[PDB]
Amino acid sequence: TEFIRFSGVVNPRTISGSNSVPSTQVADARIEYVGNGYINEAQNMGWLQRFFLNLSPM
Amino acid sequence: ERIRDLTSVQGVRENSLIGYGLVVGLDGTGDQTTQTPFTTQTLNNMLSQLGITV
Amino acid sequence: ERIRDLTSVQGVRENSLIGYGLVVGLDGTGDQTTQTPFTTQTLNNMLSQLGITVPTGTNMQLKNVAAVMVTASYPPFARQGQTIDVVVSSMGNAKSLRGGTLLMTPLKGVDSQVYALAQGNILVGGVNQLNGGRITNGAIIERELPTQFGAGNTINLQLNDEDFTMAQQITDAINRARGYGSATALDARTVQVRVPSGNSSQVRFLADIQNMEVNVTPQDAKVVINSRTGSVVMNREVTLDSCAVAQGNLSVTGGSLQSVRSSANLNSVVRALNALGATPMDLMSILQSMQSAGCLRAKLEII
Amino acid sequence: ERIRDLTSVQGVRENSLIGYGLVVGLDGTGDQTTQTPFTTQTLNNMLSQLGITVPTGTNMQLKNVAAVMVTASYPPFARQGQTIDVVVSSMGNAKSLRGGTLLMTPLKGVDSQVYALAQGNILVGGVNQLNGGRITNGAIIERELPTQFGAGNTINLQLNDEDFTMAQQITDAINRARGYGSATALDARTVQVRVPSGNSSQVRFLADIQNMEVNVTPQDAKVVINSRTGSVVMNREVTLDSCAVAQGNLSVTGGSLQSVRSSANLNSVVRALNALGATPMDLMSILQSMQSAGCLRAKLEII
Amino acid sequence: ERIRDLTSVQGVRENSLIGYGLVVGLDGTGDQTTQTPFTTQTLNNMLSQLGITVPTGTNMQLKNVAAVMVTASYPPFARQGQTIDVVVSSMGNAKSLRGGTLLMTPLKGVDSQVYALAQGNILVGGVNQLNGGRITNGAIIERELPTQFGAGNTINLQLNDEDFTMAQQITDAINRARGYGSATALDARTVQVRVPSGNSSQVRFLADIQNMEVNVTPQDAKVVINSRTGSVVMNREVTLDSCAVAQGNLSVTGGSLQSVRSSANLNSVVRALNALGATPMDLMSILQSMQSAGCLRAKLEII
């Protein structure tokens, strides 16, 4: 399952005649594109690797 | 009527006001709008304010 | 009827309303719609609102539709349901608006709020303007404005033209037929009157006030010159001093320097200036030069 | 008949209805339908509703069908089943609507609700407009509007033109033939009358009120200039002051500066202005210049 | 005959019926059928219904068949088996419908239900319209509408034009020849009458009511201008005020500013307006300008 979430503030005078506005005209743009399932679980670093990435000297 | 025609009162004066506008309803005798971009730009501004986004 | 024709009541004023609309029913004299995309865009908007969704990718080439701007005046104390006249002016490359019909148009104010709804049949003269028309009772008021009329015991009459003598004269006229302290002049353009507390009481008071007659006092001497239309207008209080005037192709009828007799009243001024035998185009330059020299004892305004 | 011709009743108003339709039966003077896709799209919609599904990929090139906009007025206290007149205006590249027939058209309000259904035969004059016609009793009311008429003991008469004197005069006229406190003016445009509680009682009261005659009081001095049609109209209360007028190709009949005699009534004004020998196109500029100078003691409006 | 000519009965109304059909028997003046696929599609549908299945892939190029829209009015209290007149209008690129015959056509209502079946011979005038005709008794009613007539003790007479005075006058007329409390006006457009319980009793009551004569009261002053046909109509209650009128190429017969005498009745108005020597095209602009100024004491409507 993939979730695409959006939030922001849109000025009405930027909306085109087709009731559409580019995402770069939205002030507080919050764009999220996440997913779940084993496909997403395969793109998270292992806890030990994620610890060595932060605490290893080099 | 001599004093009014000869003098003016202090503080009783006229100022100058200026503005920009559009004149509509001409019989084909308006701007070419290809050499005056501000005419079309301000018309689009007026339409966008009124609720039409060209 | 002098006070109503000379002054205006404070808070009793007219606003300006503007809106955009479409005019349909023209005999092939509408927009080209290939150079005015907003006409077709707003027609498609109207159809989509009415229940017809024309495909986005398509060519509409209309000939009986024109995009117009509608202007009107919001009258004082306007109440919803009343009707006002509107002026309809074409906006892009339309040949004529002869027998068109204005579709539903919301007339916005300065605050971008709808105060009237406009729809009707345009009347075009038929050297007459073809892209401009007028619709009598073409718009219906939909919103009302709150006002402070009827609140307080002061009402300001605002003179159309500023004059201390005229303000004092109106003050003395109101204070003769309406009590001792019924009016006080505040400046050259404002007369403050004391009104009874209430709403109908102030209406009655102002009805009395408005039809009173005031003796208009001499009002400045001025010569108005309109060079764009080539017209000159002089009021009664314009005088002249004796001085010599010379201009091209004008001569005494015998040199080119003609003496202009000092003049006290307006008839003397007209006779002296007609003695020069000057065309109004030449008369404008003569008047400007005399104002520079000092013969013309008046205020020269160029409108 | 003065009160009905001068005022309007609060809540007794006309709305505007709009709709889209097709006109059929034209003699080859309809849309091209290649530049107006909505005509063929809505014809296909009508056929699909009626039971004929034309293939999506096909070329229809009609000549007897035109897409039109229908406009009407929703009258006060309209009841379902009554008939109203409609105006039919072509919308795209149609030559004429001479003998067409308007198919079933739902007339929407501002709230996008159907208030009338329109269908009939168009009457086109036959220099006459060909893309605009009128159908008498062409639409039947299908929806009614709730109203507050008959509720409460106050009714507002709204003056067509704002005037404190006229409002006070109507107040005094209603309060002479209908009791002491039967009317109170609220502003320059509104007269509040006290009516009995009920529905038929208010109808009877307003029937009495409407046909009363009020003596119209002097009403402002104004000169209306319509430059688009080249017309000038002056009412009775327009006066003049003595001043000199000069304009191109106009001369005393002997200089170019003609003295205009002060004028008290309208006949004097007409005689003085005709003494100049000015065409109305020149007369408009003369009036504007005189208003600037101060000779013209009236309100100059440009419509 | 006044009450029937002024009002309508509640629930006694006419509906609109629409349908699609084919007209056959034309002398080569039908659709091209290459640009109007629905004509051939519906002809193939008719043949398939009748027992002839034309192959799907084939070229039919007809000349004696036209696809038409049929419109009719469903009359009040219509019973199945009765006949009504229909109007037949061509729909695509047909030259004429001179001597065609309308095939079986089901006339649907707004609810898309068949209320009549239409079939007959079209009568086309023969500057006459060729794609529009009328069939007298061309449709037979097949469905009836339930009604509430005869139920209850109230019947509403709906005035064609809203007027408090006329509503009160009808109320007083019904209450003079038919008992004390036989009618009560509800608003400016509705008069509620009390009827006996039953069906024939209400029929008798309304038969009595309908032929009663009411004295029509003065009804507003209005000037109707039809710019598309160039016509002006003024009713009796139109008056004028003394004011000056100027327009292009019009002069006193000697300046261009002509004084219009105040006028009380309609004959005075006609004489004063004819004194200007104005063409109706000029007269429309004159009337609009006078309405703006205030000379014209009437309601100017543009139709």
Ordered DSSP codes for C100-158: -EEEEEEEE-TTS-EEEEEEEE-B------SSEEEEEEEEEE-------TTSSSEEEEE
SS3 readout for chain D: CHHHHHEEECCCCCEEEEEEEEEECCCCCCCCCCCCHHHHHHHHHHHHHHCCCCCCCCCCCCCCEEEEEEEEEECCCCCCCCEEEEEEEECCCCCCCCCCEEEEEEEECCCCCEEEEEEEECECCCCCCCCEEEEEEEEEECCCCCCCCCCCCEEEEEECCCCHHHHHHHHHHHHHHCCCCCEEECCCCEEEEECCCCCHHHHHHHHHHHCCCCCCCCCCCEEEEECCCCEEEECCCCEECCEEEEECCCCCCCCCEEEECCECCHHHHHHHHHCCCCCHHHHHHHHHHHHHHCCEECEEEEC
**Nearest Cβ partner for C120 among E228, E281, E302:** E302
Phi, psi of E234 (to 5 degrees): -120, 135
Q: Residue C197 gets which letter from DSSP?
A: S
Task: Identify the burial level of D235 via C-beta atoms within 10 angstroms of its C-beta, where 0-12 means exposed, 13-18 middle and 19 or more buried.
Answer: buried
* Neighbour tally for E250: CB within 10 Å: 20
CA distance C50 to D19: 7
Please, are residues E281 and E228 in contact by the beta-carbon 8 Å criterion? Answer: no
Amino acid (1-letter code) at residue A44: N
Instruction: Taking each helix axis as running N to C, give the angle between helix E164-177 and helix D200-210, from 0 to 180 degrees, rounded to the nearest 10.
Output: 120
Cβ-Cβ contacts under 8 Å, C130 against chain B: 27
Q: Given an 8 Å threshold on Cβ–Cβ distance, is D132 in contact with E255?
A: no
What are the structure tokens assigned to C248, written together? 């091209």
Amino acid (1-letter code) at residue C72: A
Q: Does C53 touch chain A (CB under 8 A)?
A: no
Q: Given an 8 Å threshold on Cβ–Cβ distance, is C297 in contact with B5?
A: yes
Q: Residue E100 gets which letter from DSSP?
A: -
Phi, psi of C96 (to 5 degrees): -160, 165
CA distance A4 to D18: 42
CA distances from D54 to B46, E19, E40, E56 (A): 42, 16, 10, 14
CA distances from C284 to C248, C300, D207, E264 (A): 13, 10, 62, 47
Q: Given an 8 Å threshold on Cβ–Cβ distance, is C203 in contact with D188?
A: yes
Question: What three-state secondary structure class fits E195?
Answer: coil
CA distance C106 to C143: 11
What are the structure tokens assigned to D93, written together? 């590249």
Q: Given an 8 Å threshold on Cβ–Cβ distance, is E301 in contact with C99?
A: no
CA distances from B15 to A16, C135, C198, D53 (A): 42, 36, 38, 71
Q: Which helix (H) or strand (E) holds C18?
A: strand C15-24
What are the structure tokens assigned to D183, written together? 């009317």
Spatial CA neighbour of D135 closest among D148, D151, D147, D118: D118
Q: Residue C181 gets which letter from DSSP?
A: T
- Could you tell me which chain D residue has the CA closest to the CA of E189? D77
CA distance D175 to E143: 58
Task: Identify the burial level of C209 via C-beta atoms within 10 angstroms of its C-beta, where 0-12 means exposed, 13-18 middle and 19 or more buried.
Answer: buried
Q: Which residue has the tokens 């407009």?
A: D129
Q: Which helix (H) or strand (E) holds C266?
A: helix C266-275
CA distance E236 to E226: 18
Amino acid (1-letter code) at residue D51: G
- The β-bridge partners of E66 are E23
CA distances from E96 to D120, D121, E71, E133 (A): 20, 18, 18, 10
Q: Does E173 touch chain C (CB under 8 A)?
A: no
Spatial CA neighbour of D129 closest among D86, D98, D99, D93: D98
Furthest C-alpha separation in chain C: 84
Q: Tell me the helix, strand and coil percentages in chain E, rounded to 5.
A: 20, 35, 45
**Nearest Cβ partner for E302 among C123, C126, C127:** C123
E with B: 3 or more CB pairs under 8 Å?
Answer: no
Q: Given an 8 Å threshold on Cβ–Cβ distance, is B49 in contact with A16?
A: no
Question: What three-state secondary structure class fits C163?
Answer: coil
Amino acid (1-letter code) at residue C120: G
CA distance C275 to C288: 18
CA distance C299 to C296: 8
Cβ-Cβ contacts under 8 Å, D57 against chain C: none
> Resolution to 1 decimal, in Å?
3.0
- Dihedral, D93, D95, D97, D101 alpha carbons, nearest 10: -60
Instruction: Taking each helix axis as running N to C, give the angle between helix D164-177 and helix C200-210, from 0 to 180 degrees, rounded to the nearest 10.
Output: 120
Sign of CA dihedral E109, E115, E121, E124: negative
CA distance E142 to C196: 73
CA distance C292 to C295: 8
- Could you tell me which chain A residue has the CA closest to the CA of B46? A13
Spatial CA neighbour of D141 closest among D192, D216, D47, D78: D78
- Dihedral, A42, A45, A48, A54 alpha carbons, nearest 10: 180
- Could you tell me which chain A residue has the CA closest to the CA of B49? A13
Residues near E219 by beta carbon (within 8 Å), at least 6 away in sequence:
E161, E163, E166, E235, E237
Furthest C-alpha separation in chain D: 84
**Nearest Cβ partner for B24 among C38, C41, C90:** C90
Cβ-Cβ contacts under 8 Å, E291 against chain C: 136
Q: Does A16 touch chain B (CB under 8 A)?
A: yes
CA distance C37 to C91: 12
Spatial CA neighbour of D44 closest among C59, E57, E32, C54: C54
Q: How many Å lie between the alpha carbon of B26 and the closest alpha carbon of chain C?
A: 6
Q: Which residue has the tokens 């509040």?
A: D192
Q: What angle do CA B6, B9, B11 make, to 5 degrees?
A: 145
D with E: 3 or more CB pairs under 8 Å?
Answer: yes
Q: Residue E288 gets which letter from DSSP?
A: H
Please, are residues C269 and C234 in contact by the beta-carbon 8 Å criterion? Answer: yes
Q: Given an 8 Å threshold on Cβ–Cβ distance, is B54 in contact with C69?
A: no
CA distances from C85 to C24, C89, C103, D189 (A): 19, 13, 15, 17
- Dihedral, D37, D38, D39, D40 alpha carbons, nearest 10: 60
Q: Given an 8 Å threshold on Cβ–Cβ distance, is D222 in contact with E164?
A: no
Total residues found in chain C within this entry: 303
Please, are residues E204 and E193 in contact by the beta-carbon 8 Å criterion? Answer: no
CA distances from C155 to C183, C189, D80 (A): 9, 13, 49
Q: Which helix (H) or strand (E) holds C205?
A: helix C200-210
CA distance D98 to E128: 10
Q: Given an 8 Å threshold on Cβ–Cβ distance, is B52 in contact with C37?
A: no
Amino acid (1-letter code) at residue E163: D
* Neighbour tally for E113: CB within 10 Å: 12
Technique behind this structure?
A: cryo-EM
CA distance C261 to C275: 10
Question: What three-state secondary structure class fits C268?
Answer: helix
What are the structure tokens assigned to C245, written together? 């005037």
Touching chains, D (3+ CB pairs < 8 A) = C, E
CA distances from D141 to C117, D85, E159 (A): 21, 11, 14
